[PDB]
Amino acid sequence: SQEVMKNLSLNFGKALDECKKEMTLTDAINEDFYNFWKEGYEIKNRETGCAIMCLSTKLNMLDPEGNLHHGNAMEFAKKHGADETMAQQLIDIVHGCEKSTPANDDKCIWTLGVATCFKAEIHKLNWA
């Protein structure tokens, strides 16, 4: 289902401008979020990584552990209209990159990769 998925990404990217002012993030992340659904775009602004992570915080997707509130991530999905196997898929992929995807200590870099693997799955699922 793409219909709801647009709403998820939409309502995810609400608090972005707050995070921009907070963390000094450039306008160049609008571009990533606008062109994210291209057929061979590659995401190399580390700031989009950190913007995503700030949005994830603001949408309350972090447990006390910092290992993703997969619990609340599923609420977000069903809250926006998501199917069951859908909401499970987004967690299984996300949970399935939060550690599998290597990065440095750089949590911006980290979350950038977690989004970038996950993106490709959304393409395979034809959710774009």
UniProtKB/Swiss-Prot annotation:
Domain of life of the organism encoding this protein: Eukaryota
Expression (tissue specificity): Antenna.
Keyword Signal listed: yes
Any one Gene Ontology BP term: response to pheromone
Disulfide bonds: C19-C54, C50-C108, C97-C117
GO MF annotation terms: pheromone binding
Keywords: Disulfide bond, Pheromone response, Pheromone-binding, Signal, Transport
Residue stretches spanning the membrane: none
Subunit-level organization: Homodimer.
Function description: This major soluble protein in olfactory sensilla of male moths serves to solubilize the extremely hydrophobic pheromone molecules such as bombykol and to transport pheromone through the aqueous lymph to receptors located on olfactory cilia.
Family: Belongs to the PBP/GOBP family.
Name of the protein in question: Pheromone-binding protein
Region of the whole protein represented: 23 to 150 of 164
